Curated annotation (Swiss-Prot), chain D:
<keyword id="KW-0689">Ribosomal protein</keyword>
<comment type="subunit">
    <text>Component of the small ribosomal subunit. Mature ribosomes consist of a small (40S) and a large (60S) subunit.</text>
</comment>
<dbReference type="GO" id="GO:0008168">
    <property type="term" value="F:methyltransferase activity"/>
</dbReference>
<dbReference type="GO" id="GO:0032259">
    <property type="term" value="P:methylation"/>
</dbReference>
<dbReference type="GO" id="GO:0003735">
    <property type="term" value="F:structural constituent of ribosome"/>
</dbReference>
<keyword id="KW-0687">Ribonucleoprotein</keyword>
<dbReference type="GO" id="GO:0005737">
    <property type="term" value="C:cytoplasm"/>
</dbReference>
<dbReference type="GO" id="GO:1990904">
    <property type="term" value="C:ribonucleoprotein complex"/>
</dbReference>
<protein>
    <recommendedName>
        <fullName>Small ribosomal subunit protein eS24</fullName>
    </recommendedName>
</protein>
<dbReference type="GO" id="GO:0005840">
    <property type="term" value="C:ribosome"/>
</dbReference>
<keyword id="KW-0963">Cytoplasm</keyword>
<dbReference type="GO" id="GO:0006412">
    <property type="term" value="P:translation"/>
</dbReference>
<comment type="similarity">
    <text>Belongs to the eukaryotic ribosomal protein eS24 family.</text>
</comment>
<keyword id="KW-0808">Transferase</keyword>
<keyword id="KW-0489">Methyltransferase</keyword>
Amino acid sequence: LPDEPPPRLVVIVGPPGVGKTTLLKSLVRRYTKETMSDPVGPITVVTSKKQRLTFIECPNELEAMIDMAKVADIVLLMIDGNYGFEMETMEFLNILANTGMPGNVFGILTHLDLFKKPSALKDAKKRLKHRLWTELYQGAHLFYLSRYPDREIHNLSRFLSVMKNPRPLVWRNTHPYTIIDNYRDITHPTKIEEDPLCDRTIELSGYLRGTNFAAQGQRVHIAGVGDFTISKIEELPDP
Amino acid sequence: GKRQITWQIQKNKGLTPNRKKEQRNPRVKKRKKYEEKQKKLRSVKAVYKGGEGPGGYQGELSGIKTNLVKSVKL
Amino acid sequence: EAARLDSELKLVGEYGLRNKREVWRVLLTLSKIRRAARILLTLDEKDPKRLFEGNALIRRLVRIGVLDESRMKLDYVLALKAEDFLERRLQTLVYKLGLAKSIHHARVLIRQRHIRVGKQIVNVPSFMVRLDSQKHIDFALTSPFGGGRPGRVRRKKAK
Amino acid sequence: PVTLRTRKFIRNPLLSRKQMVVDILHPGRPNISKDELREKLATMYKAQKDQVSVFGLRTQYGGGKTTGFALIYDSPEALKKFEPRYRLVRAGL
Amino acid sequence: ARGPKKHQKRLSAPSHWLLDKLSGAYAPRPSTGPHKLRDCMPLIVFVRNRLKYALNYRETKAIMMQRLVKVDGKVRTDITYPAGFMDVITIEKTGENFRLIYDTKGRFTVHRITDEEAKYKLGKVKRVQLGRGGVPFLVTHDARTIRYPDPLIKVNDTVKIDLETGKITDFIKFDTGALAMITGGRNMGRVGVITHRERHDGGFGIVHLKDALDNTFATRESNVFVIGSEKPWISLPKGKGVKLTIAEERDQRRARAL
Amino acid sequence: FGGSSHAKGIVLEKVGVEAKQPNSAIRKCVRVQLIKNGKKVTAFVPNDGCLNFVDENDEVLLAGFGRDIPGVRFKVVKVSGVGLLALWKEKKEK
RNA sequence: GAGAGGAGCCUGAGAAACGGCUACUACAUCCAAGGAAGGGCAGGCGCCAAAUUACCCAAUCCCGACACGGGGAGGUAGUGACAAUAAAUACUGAUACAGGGCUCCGGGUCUUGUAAUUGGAAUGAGUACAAUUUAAAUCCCUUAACGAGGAACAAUUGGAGGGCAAGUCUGGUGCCAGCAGCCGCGGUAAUUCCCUCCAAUAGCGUAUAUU
């Protein structure tokens, strides 16, 4: 699929540090133009001439981690320092080795402030880098962030800004998918008001990622809830 | 309340051949190998092992065999 | 082969070693020394580099106590073997000087910091002890065998 | 305690400090705390707490001996106008 | 190359200074002044290396800037400008000085020396020629211009000035059969005694020298430096500047060792 | 196959998965599409358990031998980058 | 030695100075479309991924109204099984029971073992108060204190060989033989059951070129 590409999807995975996930989220937000606080779910970020990106916060539910493990274009693997690993990182890692191997997965490492000695930090860094090397790839790129630096996130940008190729995985070559950016609820006010629960029409709006859609009357799966049918397609134009 | 990772996870042994505590240390393994091959040379050839001990020759213990000629023709 | 396996098994059994790498190491240094003695024997006597160079080599091997101080000839330094070097090594001097009960106990009592050699304390059991420094092999001062504190098991025993 | 034997003293009349070698020992103790040693070079060569500069101070092998290269002034303004800045901020100045 | 730089290289640093091979790239290059590159000896190299009276340049500038050190009575608050030749350097408190001389090996050495013996200076005539006003004045080898001398005092005389106005109180005459330091050639920096002078129309007429123990060497007039007739003005260097052999002088050192 | 030491390949057909003997050479051999040469050579997967890991269409690295079908010549060493013995042991996933 | 590019120009002690002006030549950026400002090496990918986007002018040294102000020389550290070096993963007793252990068809030798019961010492990896080293940190050198009983503080890489079902598959003049067997009646908080030998050993295997 040689498309003039959509935003490449980057995952932020890790243990239940939610402050870690939104930490790196708002951190790379301040690397790009904005400075906003509250994260919407999928948030696209313009980078340079090849392809802009998009960023997401994987919740602590690993059903969503296997959903976005099916999605992920490139991977950011956010991991503790004084704790070793937790289970959810490994579950995502071989859940992704099973689902489909992306072109780029990167380790990135937090909580380096909570130490006592640079010998202990260096020993745990070499050990933990070795366990990423045996679980993931021989000589992968791991990273370190001590709590808001800018130079480390700058060369991090110099690694996720030189996108190579989203290596042709088969399912993502022949299956059409789209992560819903904007949630939109269209219902008649006597349908939503007179009936407490009947059904509601939902305009999910997003960027077409997969193979080409059906021009009329498509069946479509939505994660968790189930498979539904498209009542309508509109398309916002682009420059 | 963090999910601790277990030991096989940390060290992917997987399915390795079961090995010995004597094989764990190579110096112990060559120590237990030399003791056995010192033992087997007792069975084959004749070792000195001291002369008459304390008691002073209680006879030729472990028998005497009269037909046997254990010698190198020269 | 099998002559090397029984030979190096006899060396790793006579003297308490861990692998055959140290055997090959000792035979390598003996190959260099015996090689130098050979190529000094190529010249005649009264070749002054055989006199002074071979004289210096036999003085150095008398000094580190491998060649016995009685014999003073380069043929007698050609006639060496690896049990001289392993007989001069520190571990076997701990056992043959009776600080230890067995040779593996001697290597434990060397990696364990219990022995000193003169002023140093020596962790390496492959330490080529000099003949002059042979006498001063003894237990270290902070060890339980050279005075000092009685160590972990007796501390947890007193408590 | 600490044992104190000074080697190669020089009166150093050029700067009104003193080019001193001060060789100390702590046998059996942990290490010697050079600010407490700035409370030790006060009566032995008549210095106040400001004008005791100490550096070098490499402990010899196996505990015990410890070499120290020290410099005592005769005025704290000579300390400030003759002393380096990292030695000042390390020296609480 | 193509104009001046102030960076000195370290493998090419010459003999008189005793610089370390360590500590980064660059060495303390001397800048312009009285003398050339060779017989220069800065206060950087002098008070830090030759005397060990320094730790770093906070201390050395902290010595130099406070007006305690004098060079010919001048303050000389500069690090790159040189100290001269056969030098008089001041430690005026307790009344001592530093004459720089050669050793018996040919390199410079410090000497604590008195106020009188320091307060005169032995400076060679470089030139006696005609300038403005119609007078032949004297260009010294080291620093200054001695205007209105005695009119027959010519070149190659080495002058006892009193250092105070630059005026001749005595001179040592360029002569055959006289005692002279040599600063150049294959045998540079040696006290000897000249036996002859040769003319050599074609450049640099020379002297034959034959020392106390009959060793002959013929060196040029540009490097000869007549240091004394007998008249011990300056301090005597070690071993009378004879430069004997290392083995025999070594046996003399072991003989005179305490 | 003397210029390079390992050749990549596409697993084309698992030849003889319907055999009866569990560790016979019929069940062990696998048809391989060589990438640069274009030829089709069969190679020995060293176990039936490793044959359960050798899947269709996958990038598979092969090597030679050195010493039921004497004449099948190559050997499957990797499947999709991961080594096949490290897949046979429980070392790595794919 | 030659340097967006020809053509000219200016400064200074020293430059045909270009990371300085003036036109012309080839592109290209802000605009309210008249006008303006514009002319480097390093980084990543590349011709499925493996060496930091580190900290300092503290030393040594250089430059300026000049003790301060400035330094992409230099120093300090981080990764690294490509090598090269030293060597951990234990040491030592006591008793009890067993009678065979080993070696070449019949020989030859005399103490050997135990998933047997117990007792001792030894601690070094590591955890780490401190202090020190240092521009600051770290490593080092000191260093109080904790720090070993296997189910652990959890040595590997190769090869050779034995045993096995109410299992499976194949051959064939019953009961045999073959290849092989994580798969068996039940049972997964269900079960507690079978290994020996050789090699190198913090290193080892494999493929081709091969010598």
